[PDB]
Design a protein around this ligand. Structure first.
Ligand SMILES: Cc1cn([C@H]2C[C@H](OP(=O)(O)O)[C@@H](COP(=O)(O)O)O2)c(=O)[nH]c1=O
Ligand SMILES: [Ca+2]
Length: 129
């Protein structure tokens, strides 16, 4: 897997954001996670956490996995990094997302995220509180 450049266009919610990738605007959906919708418990906190993480970053990167790069809704599917720190993992570690949507061929960082989730749970963070 390799990281590619991208620029924030706009935060949307916990696990989605608009980025410009290869000079084109695209909604990205975070691989391997599920944040609550804004209208749900921990939804706003999830949205706020990622927004801050990406808006504060000097460098956003996208990392496609080995399988599908686009979902059925035309969203990019990737691991997103903000100054070297993976947003997908950070959300899980804070108990602001669950490991979810783990399809074969796009699950390279599954164990890593599961590791993060187990630690969030032990700490009973946010969603596990
Ligand atoms: C994360 C992810 C979601 N999706 C699809 C599954 C769900 O379709 P359905 O809505 O039909 O169940 C939807 C959930 O996205 P949200 O969690 O953003 O709603 O996105 C993929 O197809 N691939 C993925 O890697
Ligand atoms: Ca969601």
């Amino acid at each position: 897997l390799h990281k590619e450049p991208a620029t924030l266009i706009k935060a949307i919610d916990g696990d989605t954001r608009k980025l410009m990738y290869k000079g084109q605007p695209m909604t990205f959906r975070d691989l391997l996670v599920d944040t609550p919708e804004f209208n749900e418990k921990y939804g706003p906190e999830a949205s706020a956490f990622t927004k801050k993480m990406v808006e504060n970053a000097k460098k956003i990167e996208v990392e496609f996995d080995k399988g599908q790069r686009t979902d059925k809704y035309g969203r990019g599917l990737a691991y997103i990094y903000a100054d070297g720190k993976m947003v997908n993992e950070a959300l899980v570690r804070q108990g602001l997302a669950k490991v979810a949507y783990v399809y074969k061929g796009n699950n390279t960082h599954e164990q890593l995220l599961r590791k993060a989730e187990a630690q969030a749970k032990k700490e009973k963070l946010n969603i596990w509180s």
